Protein backbone atom coordinates (compact mmCIF):
# COMPACT_ATOMS: atom_id res chain seq x y z
CA UNK A 1 0.00 0.00 0.00
CA UNK A 2 0.87 3.68 0.21
CA UNK A 3 2.70 5.60 2.95
CA UNK A 4 4.24 9.01 3.60
CA UNK A 5 6.89 7.50 5.81
CA UNK A 6 7.69 3.83 6.38
CA UNK A 7 9.91 3.05 9.34
CA UNK A 8 11.29 -0.49 9.26
CA UNK A 9 12.14 -1.94 12.68
CA UNK A 10 15.12 -4.31 13.08
CA UNK A 11 14.76 -6.40 16.25
CA UNK A 12 17.75 -8.44 17.39
CA UNK A 13 17.06 -11.54 19.46
CA UNK A 14 20.28 -13.24 20.61
CA UNK A 15 19.06 -16.57 21.98
CA UNK A 16 21.37 -18.72 24.10
CA UNK A 17 21.09 -22.50 24.16
CA UNK A 18 22.10 -25.38 26.42
CA UNK A 19 21.24 -29.09 26.29
CA UNK A 20 20.16 -31.43 29.09
CA UNK A 21 21.71 -34.71 30.23
CA UNK A 22 19.66 -36.66 27.68
CA UNK A 23 20.57 -34.38 24.78
CA UNK A 24 17.41 -32.29 25.08
CA UNK A 25 17.78 -28.66 23.82
CA UNK A 26 17.03 -25.90 26.34
CA UNK A 27 16.67 -22.23 25.42
CA UNK A 28 18.34 -20.19 28.16
CA UNK A 29 16.04 -17.66 29.79
CA UNK A 30 17.57 -14.27 29.08
CA UNK A 31 18.61 -14.91 25.60
CA UNK A 32 18.79 -11.21 24.82
CA UNK A 33 16.56 -9.07 22.67
CA UNK A 34 17.43 -5.49 21.74
CA UNK A 35 15.20 -2.72 20.43
CA UNK A 36 16.35 0.39 18.53
CA UNK A 37 17.07 3.44 20.70
CA UNK A 38 14.66 6.37 20.76
CA UNK A 39 14.98 9.59 22.79
CA UNK A 40 16.64 9.71 26.21
CA UNK A 41 15.29 6.19 26.30
CA UNK A 42 15.78 2.69 25.07
CA UNK A 43 13.54 0.04 26.56
CA UNK A 44 10.55 0.94 24.45
CA UNK A 45 10.12 2.08 20.85
CA UNK A 46 6.93 3.74 19.62
CA UNK A 47 6.63 3.93 15.84
CA UNK A 48 6.24 7.56 14.75
CA UNK A 49 5.09 6.60 11.26
CA UNK A 50 2.05 5.87 9.09
CA UNK A 51 3.54 2.52 8.07
CA UNK A 52 6.17 0.08 9.30
CA UNK A 53 7.50 -3.42 8.80
CA UNK A 54 9.38 -5.63 11.22
CA UNK A 55 12.61 -7.51 10.69
CA UNK A 56 13.76 -10.07 13.22
CA UNK A 57 17.47 -10.82 13.49
CA UNK A 58 18.24 -14.08 15.30
CA UNK A 59 21.59 -15.23 16.68
CA UNK A 60 22.20 -18.45 18.59
CA UNK A 61 25.03 -19.36 20.95
CA UNK A 62 25.66 -22.66 22.73
CA UNK A 63 26.64 -23.24 26.35
CA UNK A 64 28.03 -25.94 28.67
CA UNK A 65 28.95 -26.22 32.34
CA UNK A 66 28.96 -22.46 32.15
CA UNK A 67 26.87 -19.79 30.74
CA UNK A 68 29.78 -18.93 28.50
CA UNK A 69 27.64 -18.37 25.48
CA UNK A 70 30.62 -19.04 23.26
CA UNK A 71 30.08 -21.53 20.52
CA UNK A 72 28.26 -22.39 17.38
CA UNK A 73 24.83 -23.86 17.95
CA UNK A 74 24.89 -26.84 15.57
CA UNK A 75 23.15 -30.19 15.59
CA UNK A 76 19.65 -29.95 17.15
CA UNK A 77 21.01 -27.26 19.48
CA UNK A 78 20.58 -24.68 16.67
CA UNK A 79 18.00 -21.90 16.80
CA UNK A 80 16.05 -19.24 14.97
CA UNK A 81 14.28 -16.71 17.18
CA UNK A 82 10.56 -16.56 16.46
CA UNK A 83 8.13 -13.93 17.68
CA UNK A 84 4.73 -15.25 18.74
CA UNK A 85 1.28 -13.92 19.61
CA UNK A 86 1.70 -13.84 23.38
CA UNK A 87 -1.39 -12.37 24.97
CA UNK A 88 -2.48 -9.83 22.33
CA UNK A 89 -5.15 -10.52 19.64
CA UNK A 90 -2.88 -9.75 16.69
CA UNK A 91 -0.33 -12.27 15.42
CA UNK A 92 2.55 -10.21 13.98
CA UNK A 93 2.39 -12.53 10.98
CA UNK A 94 0.60 -12.76 7.66
CA UNK A 95 -3.09 -13.13 8.08
CA UNK A 96 -4.08 -11.61 4.77
CA UNK A 97 -5.21 -8.08 5.45
CA UNK A 98 -3.21 -5.56 7.48
CA UNK A 99 -2.85 -4.63 11.15
CA UNK A 100 -4.01 -1.16 11.95
CA UNK A 101 -3.17 0.99 14.94
CA UNK A 102 -3.27 4.54 16.19
CA UNK A 103 -0.29 3.59 18.33
CA UNK A 104 2.13 0.69 18.66
CA UNK A 105 5.13 0.39 20.94
CA UNK A 106 7.41 -2.49 21.90
CA UNK A 107 8.63 -2.57 25.50
CA UNK A 108 11.42 -4.57 27.13
CA UNK A 109 9.65 -3.72 30.39
CA UNK A 110 6.19 -5.04 31.43
CA UNK A 111 5.11 -1.54 32.48
CA UNK A 112 1.77 -0.23 31.21
CA UNK A 113 1.89 -2.82 28.45
CA UNK A 114 -1.29 -4.04 26.78
CA UNK A 115 0.01 -7.51 25.93
CA UNK A 116 2.95 -9.85 25.37
CA UNK A 117 4.70 -11.56 22.51
CA UNK A 118 6.22 -14.93 23.30
CA UNK A 119 9.71 -14.84 21.81
CA UNK A 120 10.72 -18.47 21.46
CA UNK A 121 13.46 -20.62 19.92
CA UNK A 122 12.36 -22.79 17.01
CA UNK A 123 14.35 -25.93 16.33
CA UNK A 124 13.78 -29.14 14.40
CA UNK A 125 13.00 -30.81 17.71
CA UNK A 126 10.86 -28.35 19.71
CA UNK A 127 10.16 -24.69 20.38
CA UNK A 128 10.57 -22.82 23.64
CA UNK A 129 9.48 -19.42 24.95
CA UNK A 130 12.46 -17.48 26.33
CA UNK A 131 11.53 -13.84 26.94
CA UNK A 132 8.53 -11.56 26.51
CA UNK A 133 7.97 -8.70 24.08
CA UNK A 134 5.55 -6.30 25.72
CA UNK A 135 3.52 -4.17 23.34
CA UNK A 136 1.56 -0.98 24.01
CA UNK A 137 -1.03 -0.25 21.32
CA UNK A 138 -4.28 1.55 20.53
CA UNK A 139 -6.91 0.43 18.00
CA UNK A 140 -7.14 2.84 15.10
CA UNK A 141 -6.42 3.44 11.43
CA UNK A 142 -3.36 5.71 11.41
CA UNK A 143 -0.44 3.27 11.52
CA UNK A 144 -0.28 0.23 9.24
CA UNK A 145 1.81 -2.92 9.69
CA UNK A 146 3.19 -4.86 6.73
CA UNK A 147 5.08 -8.22 6.50
CA UNK A 148 7.56 -9.87 6.96
Amino acid at each position, epitope marked *: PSFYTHTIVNITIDLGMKR*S*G*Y*G*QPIASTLSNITLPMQDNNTDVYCIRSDQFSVYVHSTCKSSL*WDNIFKRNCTDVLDATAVIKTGTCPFSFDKLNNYLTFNKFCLSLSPVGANCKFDVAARTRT*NEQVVRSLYVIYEEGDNIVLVPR
Partner: antibody
Amino acid sequence: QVQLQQSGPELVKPGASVKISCKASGYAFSSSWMNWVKQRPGQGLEWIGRIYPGDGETNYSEKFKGKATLTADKSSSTAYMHLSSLTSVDSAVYFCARGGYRYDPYYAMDYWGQGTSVTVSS
Amino acid sequence: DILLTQSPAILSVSPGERVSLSCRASQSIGTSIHWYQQRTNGSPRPLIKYASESISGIPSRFSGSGSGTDFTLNINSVESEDIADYFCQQTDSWPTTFGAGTKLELKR
Protein backbone atom coordinates in the same frame (compact mmCIF):
# COMPACT_ATOMS: atom_id res chain seq x y z
CA GLN B 1 1.52 -52.43 34.84
CA VAL B 2 4.83 -51.39 33.37
CA GLN B 3 7.40 -54.03 32.53
CA LEU B 4 10.28 -54.31 30.05
CA GLN B 5 11.34 -57.81 28.97
CA GLN B 6 14.87 -57.93 27.54
CA SER B 7 16.44 -60.54 25.25
CA GLY B 8 18.51 -63.44 26.58
CA PRO B 9 22.26 -63.46 27.36
CA GLU B 10 24.58 -63.16 24.36
CA LEU B 11 27.96 -64.81 23.92
CA VAL B 12 29.81 -63.36 20.97
CA LYS B 13 33.20 -63.35 19.25
CA PRO B 14 35.24 -60.13 18.84
CA GLY B 15 34.59 -58.21 15.62
CA ALA B 16 31.09 -59.62 15.42
CA SER B 17 27.92 -57.64 16.11
CA VAL B 18 25.00 -58.06 18.50
CA LYS B 19 21.44 -56.76 18.71
CA ILE B 20 19.54 -56.66 22.00
CA SER B 21 15.77 -56.79 22.33
CA CYS B 22 13.45 -55.00 24.77
CA LYS B 23 9.68 -55.52 24.59
CA ALA B 24 7.60 -53.07 26.62
CA SER B 25 4.07 -53.40 27.98
CA GLY B 26 1.68 -51.78 30.46
CA TYR B 27 2.03 -48.24 29.07
CA ALA B 28 2.05 -46.46 25.71
CA PHE B 29 5.31 -47.58 24.10
CA SER B 30 5.33 -44.70 21.62
CA SER B 31 4.93 -41.74 23.97
CA SER B 32 7.82 -42.32 26.39
CA TRP B 33 11.57 -42.19 25.82
CA MET B 34 13.46 -45.47 25.85
CA ASN B 35 16.99 -45.16 27.24
CA TRP B 36 19.80 -47.72 27.08
CA VAL B 37 22.36 -47.97 29.90
CA LYS B 38 25.60 -49.97 30.04
CA GLN B 39 26.67 -51.49 33.34
CA ARG B 40 30.13 -52.99 33.55
CA PRO B 41 30.66 -55.88 36.03
CA GLY B 42 32.76 -53.98 38.57
CA GLN B 43 31.61 -50.48 37.82
CA GLY B 44 28.76 -47.98 37.53
CA LEU B 45 26.12 -46.99 35.01
CA GLU B 46 27.00 -45.54 31.60
CA TRP B 47 24.18 -43.86 29.70
CA ILE B 48 24.29 -45.01 26.08
CA GLY B 49 21.50 -43.01 24.47
CA ARG B 50 17.73 -42.77 24.11
CA ILE B 51 15.13 -43.19 21.38
CA TYR B 52 11.60 -41.82 21.13
CA PRO B 53 9.59 -44.45 19.17
CA GLY B 54 6.99 -41.84 18.16
CA ASP B 55 9.20 -41.13 15.17
CA GLY B 56 12.58 -42.64 15.89
CA GLU B 57 14.30 -39.57 17.26
CA THR B 58 17.69 -40.91 18.22
CA ASN B 59 20.32 -39.50 20.61
CA TYR B 60 23.72 -40.87 21.63
CA SER B 61 26.59 -40.22 24.01
CA GLU B 62 29.82 -39.21 22.29
CA LYS B 63 31.50 -42.37 23.59
CA PHE B 64 28.85 -44.54 21.95
CA LYS B 65 28.36 -42.91 18.54
CA GLY B 66 29.03 -45.40 15.76
CA LYS B 67 28.95 -48.35 18.15
CA ALA B 68 25.33 -48.32 19.28
CA THR B 69 22.36 -48.19 16.95
CA LEU B 70 18.89 -47.87 18.47
CA THR B 71 15.70 -48.86 16.70
CA ALA B 72 12.05 -49.26 17.67
CA ASP B 73 9.30 -51.27 15.99
CA LYS B 74 6.27 -49.22 16.98
CA SER B 75 3.59 -51.84 16.36
CA SER B 76 5.79 -54.51 17.93
CA SER B 77 6.31 -52.64 21.21
CA THR B 78 9.88 -53.94 21.06
CA ALA B 79 12.94 -51.68 21.21
CA TYR B 80 16.33 -52.85 19.93
CA MET B 81 19.99 -51.90 20.32
CA HIS B 82 22.68 -52.97 17.85
CA LEU B 83 26.39 -52.99 18.74
CA SER B 84 29.09 -53.27 16.08
CA SER B 85 32.68 -54.55 16.14
CA LEU B 86 32.40 -55.99 19.66
CA THR B 87 35.51 -56.00 21.84
CA SER B 88 36.65 -57.15 25.28
CA VAL B 89 35.66 -53.79 26.75
CA ASP B 90 32.18 -54.13 25.26
CA SER B 91 31.49 -57.07 27.54
CA ALA B 92 28.84 -56.02 30.05
CA VAL B 93 25.19 -56.07 31.08
CA TYR B 94 22.97 -53.62 29.17
CA PHE B 95 19.76 -52.20 30.63
CA CYS B 96 16.88 -50.71 28.67
CA ALA B 97 14.89 -48.15 30.66
CA ARG B 98 11.85 -45.89 30.41
CA GLY B 99 11.99 -42.10 30.44
CA GLY B 100 9.66 -39.11 30.31
CA TYR B 101 7.25 -37.81 27.69
CA ARG B 102 8.57 -36.12 24.53
CA TYR B 103 9.63 -32.69 25.75
CA ASP B 104 10.89 -33.84 29.14
CA PRO B 105 14.59 -32.85 29.42
CA TYR B 106 15.45 -33.91 33.00
CA TYR B 107 13.42 -37.06 33.73
CA ALA B 108 14.55 -39.92 35.95
CA MET B 109 14.48 -43.34 34.29
CA ASP B 110 11.24 -44.93 35.42
CA TYR B 111 11.22 -48.68 34.90
CA TRP B 112 14.16 -50.84 33.87
CA GLY B 113 14.56 -54.20 32.14
CA GLN B 114 16.09 -57.29 33.74
CA GLY B 115 19.28 -56.51 31.86
CA THR B 116 21.06 -58.37 29.08
CA SER B 117 24.46 -59.86 29.71
CA VAL B 118 26.80 -59.53 26.76
CA THR B 119 30.16 -61.30 26.90
CA VAL B 120 32.69 -60.79 24.13
CA SER B 121 35.14 -63.66 23.98
CA SER B 122 37.45 -65.36 21.53
CA ASP C 1 31.64 -33.91 31.22
CA ILE C 2 30.50 -33.17 34.78
CA LEU C 3 31.93 -35.67 37.27
CA LEU C 4 29.80 -36.94 40.15
CA THR C 5 31.51 -38.15 43.32
CA GLN C 6 29.88 -40.34 45.94
CA SER C 7 31.34 -40.72 49.43
CA PRO C 8 32.17 -43.00 50.96
CA ALA C 9 32.69 -45.86 48.50
CA ILE C 10 31.51 -48.38 51.08
CA LEU C 11 29.40 -47.79 54.16
CA SER C 12 28.96 -50.16 57.09
CA VAL C 13 25.48 -50.03 58.59
CA SER C 14 23.30 -51.99 61.01
CA PRO C 15 19.51 -52.39 60.89
CA GLY C 16 17.64 -49.49 62.47
CA GLU C 17 20.54 -47.07 62.03
CA ARG C 18 20.11 -43.64 60.54
CA VAL C 19 22.26 -43.21 57.44
CA SER C 20 23.16 -40.55 54.90
CA LEU C 21 24.73 -41.02 51.48
CA SER C 22 26.61 -38.29 49.60
CA CYS C 23 26.96 -37.06 46.03
CA ARG C 24 28.95 -34.00 44.96
CA ALA C 25 28.85 -32.72 41.39
CA SER C 26 31.67 -30.85 39.67
CA GLN C 27 29.35 -27.91 39.09
CA SER C 28 25.87 -26.62 39.91
CA ILE C 29 23.05 -28.76 38.55
CA GLY C 30 20.18 -27.30 40.54
CA THR C 31 17.84 -30.06 41.64
CA SER C 32 18.28 -32.02 38.43
CA ILE C 33 19.65 -35.09 40.21
CA HIS C 34 18.15 -38.51 40.86
CA TRP C 35 18.93 -41.39 43.19
CA TYR C 36 18.87 -45.04 42.16
CA GLN C 37 19.08 -48.26 44.17
CA GLN C 38 20.37 -51.56 42.83
CA ARG C 39 20.23 -54.76 44.85
CA THR C 40 22.65 -57.55 43.97
CA ASN C 41 21.90 -59.26 40.64
CA GLY C 42 19.07 -56.75 40.37
CA SER C 43 18.16 -53.78 38.21
CA PRO C 44 18.41 -50.09 39.18
CA ARG C 45 15.37 -48.35 40.70
CA PRO C 46 14.51 -44.66 41.35
CA LEU C 47 14.36 -43.85 45.06
CA ILE C 48 14.35 -40.08 45.09
CA LYS C 49 13.56 -37.80 42.18
CA TYR C 50 14.95 -34.25 41.64
CA ALA C 51 16.73 -34.90 44.96
CA SER C 52 13.91 -34.27 47.46
CA GLU C 53 10.86 -35.26 45.49
CA SER C 54 9.45 -38.52 46.83
CA ILE C 55 8.45 -41.36 44.51
CA SER C 56 5.18 -43.25 44.82
CA GLY C 57 5.80 -46.73 46.21
CA ILE C 58 9.04 -45.85 47.99
CA PRO C 59 8.93 -46.34 51.81
CA SER C 60 8.85 -43.28 54.05
CA ARG C 61 12.42 -43.88 55.24
CA PHE C 62 13.93 -42.57 52.01
CA SER C 63 14.29 -38.81 51.55
CA GLY C 64 16.44 -36.47 49.51
CA SER C 65 18.16 -33.19 50.30
CA GLY C 66 20.26 -30.63 48.49
CA SER C 67 20.45 -28.05 45.73
CA GLY C 68 23.47 -26.97 43.72
CA THR C 69 26.63 -29.03 44.11
CA ASP C 70 26.03 -30.93 47.39
CA PHE C 71 23.36 -33.63 47.73
CA THR C 72 22.45 -36.29 50.27
CA LEU C 73 20.37 -39.48 50.31
CA ASN C 74 18.74 -40.29 53.65
CA ILE C 75 17.55 -43.60 55.07
CA ASN C 76 15.71 -42.96 58.34
CA SER C 77 15.78 -46.48 59.80
CA VAL C 78 17.83 -48.96 57.80
CA GLU C 79 16.17 -52.25 56.84
CA SER C 80 17.80 -55.47 55.71
CA GLU C 81 16.41 -55.05 52.18
CA ASP C 82 18.36 -51.77 52.07
CA ILE C 83 21.66 -53.55 51.46
CA ALA C 84 22.50 -52.52 47.92
CA ASP C 85 24.42 -50.12 45.71
CA TYR C 86 23.24 -46.52 45.52
CA PHE C 87 23.91 -44.37 42.48
CA CYS C 88 23.29 -40.65 42.06
CA GLN C 89 22.52 -39.39 38.56
CA GLN C 90 23.05 -35.89 37.16
CA THR C 91 20.55 -34.91 34.46
CA ASP C 92 21.27 -31.18 34.07
CA SER C 93 24.29 -30.88 31.75
CA TRP C 94 24.97 -33.03 28.67
CA PRO C 95 25.58 -35.79 28.85
CA THR C 96 23.81 -37.33 31.84
CA THR C 97 26.37 -38.83 34.23
CA PHE C 98 26.24 -41.29 37.14
CA GLY C 99 28.32 -41.51 40.30
CA ALA C 100 30.68 -44.40 41.09
CA GLY C 101 28.08 -45.55 43.63
CA THR C 102 27.95 -46.17 47.37
CA LYS C 103 27.66 -49.78 48.56
CA LEU C 104 26.00 -50.82 51.82
CA GLU C 105 27.36 -53.76 53.84
CA LEU C 106 26.08 -55.27 57.08
CA LYS C 107 28.05 -54.51 60.23
CA ARG C 108 28.94 -57.29 62.65
